[PDB]
């Protein structure tokens, strides 16, 4: 009886005490796995972009058979977006686990070391397979679809705000009581292996007396899709509504989501989606709805079919 | 011993079973107060705008001495924004209480009737004075600064997510254990009595691979101020950052807030605000930071002084 | 249209029990509803006999109906739901519902809650998910569901693992199902039982008396659940009484007064050494339900621990 | 630089008690720190004698220092904090701190928590806010603070009314202060007491035994707090025992096992008729603290109710 082989892919700086030398910062890692590190890119998470996403997904798909699991170290600001992109595009059913740190590795009571430890525990556990892309933060295993950051600074910020966590980790053991029902990874039709770019999808915000200029600027630039961060149950300020209604009639894909941090933007409730050709995002927040819309646009431009995609993934 | 006189100002449709005839939908109101209703405007809350705000504040300031308290019925989508605008601009220290309903007045288990009842209870209670503008929803008394909507459909959606509620209502009695520390109402310098318009402030969203076109569109239109809904602790995608940095150097006021639903966007932590001339929003979310920025711009265009305003109100 | 049976255990939650279709006419559009009053008791006085009656009724009537809705007061809903979750062998939907506001109150919650419970019981997708609680537009599993606030209409939450689904306009978006075994996958069978093992609960706090625990032991209780402090720790005096009782054959489960999170095995207390069982995410009242049932099968602590790891 | 005294009640929370400035060197930049070991006990074994000792020490040493930080285990922190909140007469900051992870663990929380507690005790703005608990970058009042999760570093929350302030980079943004009276505005004075009235807690649940409650009554306890179901309701057998005890002069407080919300007076139980007291937002363990103190002044239920409405 030997240890699993886990690869750590880094996207940025170190979250505990180079990527080569993590087994020296956290020597406890040796007792759980044989670890190898690769620096895939080196960027701040706030600057995350489509090229990095494509690079990551291709790397995991290509190296899937060379390792028992993956841990990806990633900044916290856009973790939730990269996790969902990977959840839809990775075709490997071995564990893929993302992890970060809310405090810098040099600060007192840095969270990164224990988070990294727990991420490797999770990647090494056979029970973690077939659950989609996972985020491990603060002793908790979270699915890539529902996970979001709820507080600007709290070490406990990452939560699955609509449907809850998959499991909790205590003393290196995971109690899994849930798995996601929406389709992920190998069960999706999305395949990015041949793609060098993704459809252009932007996000506009709604609020009192909202300007329509952001929306117009995107339409005039020929964006493929626009996600509205609506008020309440995905409602839109009138000027924004008028702009997006005309955009949707002339070929732009329009998804109604919500600025409100929990709950679904429901179909045909507040706005007659069938009349305008809009798609309702359900529980996906604006930034995650963008991810799914970009992918849906690689397969179809028909709002009816896009809506079905939002109801399945 | 007689009952207080409470005025109900409506901004839209009825939240229980015209505004004239509310005492017939909720006859229990008669036992608590002598009620008078006025329809101030009639618009959907998603279409809320600066003109309505100015109208409301002027009406309350003008009628303050004619009544013992005010209840304003308002749609839920933008309640949080109107509440904070009033919290900063009303000069009456009698109770001003906003209320709405998450379910339509015709549906089974409509929440509006009991919410309206409780709002009048709150407006009638002497202990409610001097606490700023209040929101009463779901048996809870919430301050206009911290209150926000947390779920798209839940009757329990309104919460003061950073500092908690002021009081709870049980059987027509309020247990107040808190009052807001930030300055409000009569203690602010903001005076809208002479104003027919407010400075133009827009909001842009950050996310992976964020377009700078929304921000550029606002700058090119000559907006007075721009609020960034940043990632994490108010961070900005690089293209957005570059656009806003140049805007701030050339006279546009720029406030960093966060798309993350709780916690403060803190000063000089993630971004060197002093170098770029940016202002950090603290706990104010993007839509509320817009409210304060619009008002601050009536007094000053200097980022240092704007920052002090964000630290006091 | 499906045939749905409403079993009442107390008062009416909208506007007795065949009145319901008159109080909530909209029910006729979604199901053919029949009602029976099984008992008439306050939820605060809920007891083992009512539990046995309910489970036998459902098990016996399973073939005659397409789903069950049980009307139940809110105070102890979470206990009954878990009991039924472990003992019901019908795989048709069983849905519990109640109301936080009286049916005569302004903005009473019971009518819409009842409507949504019937919706849930009528949906094919609800089957095989265990016993469910439907409150405030949300569908919750009977194991994790608990009341979090004394008065709020939104009180019912699955505080460790989340809800199964949300209901909007009569349609349910299910994204979860419980992994722990339930209903027809458990070994527990109450069909021939007229009583259950005696299990009590003691609370821990600063300067706690051991007298409650001693009282239960002297009365020959079969098991004792401790509502511990933090991660299931015990006040010294209480610990000593329970350690002794475990040696003489009383089953002892460490749970926590803390409202979320697991009481984990062998972390704060050497469970193997004293013959204690750790409750996991089960709060004290739920841990009682499982221990009662466990004790119908075994008195061995290691086997009871295994049960607490599977159900 | 302010002079801050660290009073320890148990183990060390970073890397005994004069070591602290060596374990957390950054403390030297913000205060002149002195440490004293007051007792050395596990938090789960916290008791009335430790409480009396702590309050007398602070009251006696108030003039010699600019603020106090008390190091305390997490299990019962919420009880000690409320006791001190009612009995301390020093108006200088008193700040409690602990750690959810052992000081030797990876990513131990105690060092930064200790640093933030000293920061808080050193800030002028912290005075006159009552006794405070500083955990996970947040400043919480001793009345409302409770532990919400068995293991999470973020467990401590003021679940009904929220935190007072948040700490970022050594600065505190205070937006709240507690309205209920505390510290030097209470009538409670423990300076001449060597013991406290005897108050125990019983739990309610389905089929609850009255034996715990009877045991406390037979031992002549001065008061009993009920952890009720829902809005402080009681299982029938328990109710009957407590109704009898209240008539013979035992003080009885109805609280709730439900983790948030008030137990409200005369709503679910006719408190006036039975001579019971409703706890408001005080959970059972906190309601014990107040009832113990109330009973040093009066045995009359109407006066005890007034106390529960003011403190």
List chain B domain ranges.
1-199, 200-313
At residue D295, φ and ψ (nearest 5 deg) are: -70, -15
Q: What span, in angstroms and rounded, lies between the C-alpha atoms of B61 and A202?
A: 41
Reduced to 3 states, what is the DSSP secondary structure of residue C223?
strand
Inter-helix orientation angle C211-218/C236-247, to 10°: 20
Q: Are B225 and B198 within 8 A, CB to CB?
A: no
Tell me the shortest Cα–Cα distance from D107 to chain C, in angstroms: 18
Which residues, 6 or more positions from B258, have their beta carbon under 8 angstroms from its beta carbon?
Answer: A152, B229, B230, B231, B232, B233, B234, B265, B281, B285, B286
Domain range D1-197, its CATH number among 3.40.50.1170, 3.30.380.10, 3.30.1330.10, 3.30.1330.60: 3.40.50.1170
Closest CB to C259: pick one of D198, D230, D259.
D259
Tell me the shortest Cα–Cα distance from B98 to chain C, in angstroms: 18
* CA dist list (Å): D303 to D251, D282, D290: 11, 17, 13
Q: What span, in angstroms and rounded, lies between the C-alpha atoms of A8 and A95?
A: 12
Contact B213 A233 (CB under 8 A): no
Q: Are strands D199-203 and B253-258 parallel, antiparallel or unpaired?
A: unpaired
Contact D206 C150 (CB under 8 A): no
Contact D207 C261 (CB under 8 A): no
Cα torsion angle, B87, B90, B92, B95, sign: negative
DSSP label at residue D267: S
Contact B163 D175 (CB under 8 A): yes
Closest CB to D212: pick one of C212, C284, C288.
C212
Annotated active-site residue D298? The verdict is no
Establish whether domains C1-197 and C198-311 are of one fold: yes
* CA dist list (Å): A255 to A41, B287, C250: 31, 21, 60
Contact D111 A109 (CB under 8 A): yes
B294 φ/ψ sector (left φ>0, alpha ψ -120 to 50, else beta):
alpha
CA B293 to chain centre: 13
| Token pair 């009359």 in the structure block, residue | D300
E strands, chain C, where?
A: 3-8, 32-37, 67-71, 94-97, 132-135, 138-141, 145-147, 156-158, 165-168, 171-174, 199-203, 223-228, 251-256, 276-278
Tell me the shortest Cα–Cα distance from A159 to chain C, in angstroms: 11
Resolution (A): 1.9
Closest CB to D179: pick one of B164, B176, B263.
B176
Contact B115 C137 (CB under 8 A): no
Domain range A1-199, its CATH number among 3.40.50.1170, 1.10.3720.10, 1.10.10.10, 3.60.70.12: 3.40.50.1170
Full 3-state SS string of A61-129: HHHHHHCCEEEEECCCCCHHHHHHHHHHHCCCCCCEEEECCCCCCCCCCCCHHHHHHHHHHHHHCHHHC
Question: B155: which chain C residues are within 8 Å (Cβ-Cβ)?
Answer: 136, 153-154
Give the number of C-alpha atoms closer than 13 A to the C-alpha of residue C15, restricted to the C-beta side: 11
**Burial degree of D273 (CB within 10 A; 0-12, 13-18, 19+):** exposed
Paired tokens of A101: 């740190």
Nearest to D75 by CA among D144, D160, D151: D151
Q: What span, in angstroms and rounded, lies between the C-alpha atoms of A266 and A281?
A: 7
Contact D136 A155 (CB under 8 A): yes
The method recorded for this entry reads X-ray
At residue B227, φ and ψ (nearest 5 deg) are: -105, 125
* CA dist list (Å): C81 to A229, B238, C182, C285: 38, 52, 11, 11
Contact B171 D267 (CB under 8 A): yes
Helices (H), A125-237: 213-220
Q: What span, in angstroms and rounded, lies between the C-alpha atoms of D308 and D297?
A: 13
Question: C169: which chain A residues are within 8 Å (Cβ-Cβ)?
Answer: 266, 269
CA D128 to chain centre: 17
DSSP letters of A221-246?
Answer: TT-SEEEEEEBTTTB--HHHHHHHHH
At residue C218, φ and ψ (nearest 5 deg) are: -65, -25
Q: Which chains touch A (3 or more CB pairs under 8 A)?
A: B, C, D
Tell me the shortest Cα–Cα distance from A115 to chain D, in angstroms: 8
Which residues, 6 or more positions from B90, have their beta carbon under 8 angstroms from its beta carbon?
Answer: B57, B60, B61, B96, B133, B185
Reduced to 3 states, what is the DSSP secondary structure of residue C85?
helix
Any idea which fold D198-311 has?
Rossmann fold (3.40.50)
Cα torsion angle, B205, B210, B211, B215, sign: positive
Closest CB to D106: pick one of A28, A107, A154.
A28
CA dihedral D284, D290, D296, D298 (to 10 degrees): -90
Chain D: which residues have CB within 8 Å of chain B? 144, 158, 160-163, 166, 168-169, 173-180, 261-262, 264, 267, 280-281
Q: Are D218 and B215 within 8 A, CB to CB?
A: no
Contact B113 C136 (CB under 8 A): no
Tell me the shortest Cα–Cα distance from D122 to chain A, in angstroms: 19
Give Dmax (Cα) for chain A: 65
| CA-based R_g, chain D, Å | 20
**Burial degree of A103 (CB within 10 A; 0-12, 13-18, 19+):** middle
CA dihedral B16, B22, B26, B30 (to 10 degrees): 160
Chain C: which residues have CB within 8 Å of chain A? 144, 158, 160-163, 166, 168-169, 173-180, 261-262, 264, 267, 280-281
Q: What span, in angstroms and rounded, lies between the C-alpha atoms of D139 and D120?
A: 8
- CATH architecture of the domain A200-313 equals 3-Layer(aba) Sandwich (3.40)
Nearest to D198 by CA among A202, C207, B269: C207
Residue A176: strand pairing partners: A167
Q: Are B274 and B303 within 8 A, CB to CB?
A: no
Q: What span, in angstroms and rounded, lies between the C-alpha atoms of C231 and C250?
A: 21
Nearest to D154 by CA among D170, D166, D143, D142: D166
Q: What span, in angstroms and rounded, lies between the C-alpha atoms of B55 and B50?
A: 9
| CA-based R_g, chain C, Å | 20
Q: Which chains touch D (3 or more CB pairs under 8 A)?
A: A, B, C
Contact A178 C179 (CB under 8 A): yes
Q: Are C202 and D203 within 8 A, CB to CB?
A: yes
Closest CB to C175: pick one of A165, A171, A182.
A182
Tell me the shortest Cα–Cα distance from C129 to chain D, in angstroms: 24
Compute the residue count for chain A. Answer: 313
Question: C227: which chain D residues are within 8 Å (Cβ-Cβ)?
Answer: 203
Q: Are A110 and A170 within 8 A, CB to CB?
A: no
Type and span of the H or E element at A308: helix A303-310
């Amino acid at each position: 009886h030997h240890l699993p082989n886990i690869t750590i892919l880094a996207t940025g700086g170190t979250i505990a005490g180079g990527v080569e030398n993590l087994v020296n910062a956290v020597p406890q890692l040796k007792d759980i796995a044989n670890v190898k590190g690769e620096q895939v890119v080196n960027i701040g998470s706030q600057d995350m972009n489509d090229n990095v996403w494509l690079t990551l997904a291709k790397k995991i798909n290509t190296d899937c058979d060379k390792t028992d699991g993956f841990v990806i170290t990633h900044g916290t600001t856009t973790m939730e977006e990269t996790a969902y992109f990977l959840d839809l595009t990775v075709k490997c059913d071995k564990p893929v686990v993302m992890v970060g740190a809310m405090r810098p590795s040099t600060s007192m009571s840095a969270d990164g070391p224990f988070n990294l430890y727990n991420a490797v525990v999770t990647a090494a556990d056979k029970a973690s397979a077939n659950r989609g892309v996972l985020v491990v933060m603060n002793d908790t295993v979270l699915d890539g679809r529902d996970v979001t950051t709820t507080n600007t600074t709290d070490v406990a910020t990452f939560k699955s705000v609509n449907y809850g966590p998959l499991g909790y980790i205590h003393n290196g053991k995971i109690d899994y009581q849930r798995t996601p029902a929406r389709k992920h990874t190998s069960d999706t039709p999305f395949d990015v292996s041949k793609l060098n770019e993704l459809p252009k999808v932007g996000i506009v915000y709604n609020y009192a007396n909202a300007s329509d200029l952001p929306a117009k600027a995107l339409v005039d630039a020929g964006y493929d899709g626009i996600v509205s961060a609506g008020v309440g149950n995905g409602n839109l300020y009138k000027s924004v509504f008028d702009t997006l209604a005309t955009a949707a009639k002339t070929g732009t894909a329009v998804v109604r989501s919500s600025r409100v941090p929990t709950g679904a933007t429901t179909q045909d409730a507040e706005v007659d989606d069938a009349k305008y050709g809009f798609v309702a995002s359900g529980t996906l927040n604006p930034q995650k709805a963008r991810v799914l819309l970009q992918l849906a646009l690689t397969q179809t431009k028909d709002p009816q079919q896009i809506q079905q995609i939002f109801n399945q993934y």
